[PDB]
């Protein structure tokens, strides 16, 4: 028998809330980066790592984490992800001194480990909890919540922490943010204990009901995922797109100031528009995918619009019109962020009935690997040859992704399971 539980929204809302808190702490150091350099007496690279350590810890630690999800369950993944997020939030509090910088790195590394229990999870929570006609919407909401934390992270820290020269008052203002983040993370950890269940009493869809029957080596599951030609192409293409987004969002601030000097206030607005429009695209992508069930056609269409959005952004940023950059960043952020739930759900189509944590996780490793490569590479071309070769470097690599995306077969295995009747 198949039934849909009413508490599915609470689980996603709670998951989106404490993924919002975890994603907030990724960017809270970079939002007031100019302040933390003065407080801790460190260079901008040190602070920029505090945000880049999220990507470099995901690459090696995902496979052990994905193994924990299969063996222990989703609730243990949620508790550990919430507890480490809460533990990392509290460790940051004990670091409110100019000479006590390493405690933040220890606190940030603990949070960065908690990301491994977060970023690959949204497709897993959506599958276990939500039905066939709302499975892709739930994944978008989790990405909506994760992107909301970034969106909140741009404007909340700068008003909680004024750029005051006095150190003792600056520590007090920074302390208030840490208490609030520690307060909400502990509050959300409390909710995860009582809200997050291991699984609903009834399977939501025929895909999950059949998955529980046709679900032993963990490395065998890894091997069969890479035996899939379609999934391997999707792993590369998703990394080419999501990795470009990480390089685009990180280097967006320095690219605008290169052409529009003295617009740091607007550069943050532009960097907020790419996220403000980002979650609107993510939610729309979830509803559109579930209404039409065209996962392959949307993947190519969104990927091309990502490419066209990057081409128009590259060749119109030079013209000197500020509102044009607002539209191009918003439009590209609309599609690139909308590709994240589309990529997660299309991977489940190609890799059914393999574990959604492994399938969507392997997309994330490619996103981190290409995001790290692009951020280091595009930063080098911008410094040496200019900003336009750096943006074209993403246009050329996104062009390859579109070509490889067209080679992905429309092998929707989960859809076949639903329609078996
Ligand atoms: C009066 C007796 C009520 C009962 C016995 C009841 C029952 C439930 C149950 C069983 C759940 C899911 C939790 C779970 O399955 O473990 C739930 C959640 C919920 N209930 Fe009720 N309900 C009642 C009244 C109401 C009313 C009047 C509202 C008015 C808005 C409401 C709004 C909600 C909402 C919004 C959720 C989902 C929580 C979320 O989405 O965050 N309930 N309720």
What does this structure look like?
It is built from 17 helices and no strands. It has 421 residues and is mostly helical. The chain folds into 2 domains: 1-215, Up-down Bundle (Growth Hormone, Chain: A); 216-421, Growth Hormone, Chain: A. The longest helix is centred in the middle third of the chain and has 31 residues, at 229-259. Residues 5-7, 9-10, 13 line the site of protoporphyrin IX containing FE. It is classed as membrane protein. Keywords: human transporter, membrane protein.
Summarize the structure.
This protein is mostly helical. The protein is built from 17 helices and no strands.
Bound small-molecule species: protoporphyrin IX containing FE
- Radius of gyration, in angstroms, nearest whole number: 21 Å
* Multimeric status of the protein: monomer
User: How many distinct folded domains?
Assistant: 2
SSE succession: HHHHHHHHHHHHHHHHH
CATH topology of the largest domain: Growth Hormone, Chain: A
* Strand tally: 0
Give the helix level as a range of percent.
over 70%
- Terminal Cα separation, in Å? 13 Å
Biggest beta sheet attributes: none
The portion of residues forming beta strands comes to under 5%
Just give the CATH class of the largest domain.
Answer: Mainly Alpha
Membrane topology: Multi-pass membrane protein
GO biological process, one term: transport across blood-brain barrier
Cytoplasmic side: 72-73, 130-134, 196-228, 293-294, 351-358
GO molecular function, one term: ethanolamine transmembrane transporter activity
């Amino acid at each position: 028998v198949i039934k849909v539980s009413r508490r599915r929204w609470a689980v996603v809302l709670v998951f989106s809330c404490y993924s919002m808190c975890n994603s907030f702490q990724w960017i809270q150091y970079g939002s007031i980066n100019n302040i933390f350099m003065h407080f801790y007496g460190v260079s901008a690279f040190a602070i920029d790592w505090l945000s880049m350590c999220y990507m470099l810890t995901y690459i090696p630690l995902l496979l052990p984490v994905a193994w924990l999800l299969e063996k222990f369950g989703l609730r243990t993944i949620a508790l550990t992800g919430s507890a480490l997020n809460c533990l990392g939030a509290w460790v940051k509090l004990g670091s409110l001194k100019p000479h006590l910088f390493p405690v933040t790195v220890v606190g940030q590394l603990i949070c960065s480990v908690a990301q491994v229990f977060i970023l690959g999870m949204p497709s897993r929570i959506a599958s276990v909890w939500f039905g066939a006609n709302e499975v892709s919407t739930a994944c978008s909401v989790a990405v909506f919540g994760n992107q909301l934390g970034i969106a909140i992270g741009f404007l909340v820290p700068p008003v909680l922490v004024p750029n005051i020269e006095d150190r003792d008052e600056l520590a007090y203002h920074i302390s208030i943010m840490f208490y609030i983040i520690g307060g909400v993370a502990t509050l959300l950890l409390i909710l995860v204990i009582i809200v997050f269940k291991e699984k609903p009493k009834y399977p939501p869809s025929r895909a999950q009901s059949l998955s529980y029957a046709l679900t032993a080596s963990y490395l065998g599951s890894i091997a069969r995922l890479f035996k899939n030609l379609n999934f391997v192409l999707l792993v590369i293409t998703y990394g080419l797109n999501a990795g470009a987004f990480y390089a685009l969002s990180t280097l967006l601030n320095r690219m605008v100031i290169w052409h529009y000097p003295g617009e740091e206030v607007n550069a943050g607005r532009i960097g907020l528009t790419i996220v403000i429009a980002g979650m609107l695209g993510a939610v729309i992508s979830g509803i559109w995918l579930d209404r039409s069930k065209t996962y392959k056609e949307t993947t190519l269409v969104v990927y091309i619009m990502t490419l066209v959005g990057m081409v128009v952004y590259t060749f119109t940023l030079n013209l000197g019109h500020l509102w044009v950059v607002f539209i191009t960043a918003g439009t590209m952020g609309f599609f690139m962020t909308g590709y994240l739930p589309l990529g997660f759900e299309f991977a489940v189509e190609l890799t059914y009935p393999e574990s959604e944590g492994i399938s969507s996780g392997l997309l994330n490793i490619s996103a981190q690997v290409f995001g790290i490569i692009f951020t280091i590479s595009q930063g080098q071309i911008i410094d040496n040859y200019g900003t336009k070769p750096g943006n074209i470097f993403l246009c050329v690599f996104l062009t390859l992704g579109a070509a490889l995306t067209a080679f992905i077969k429309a092998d929707l295995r989960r859809q076949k399971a639903n329609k078996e009747t």
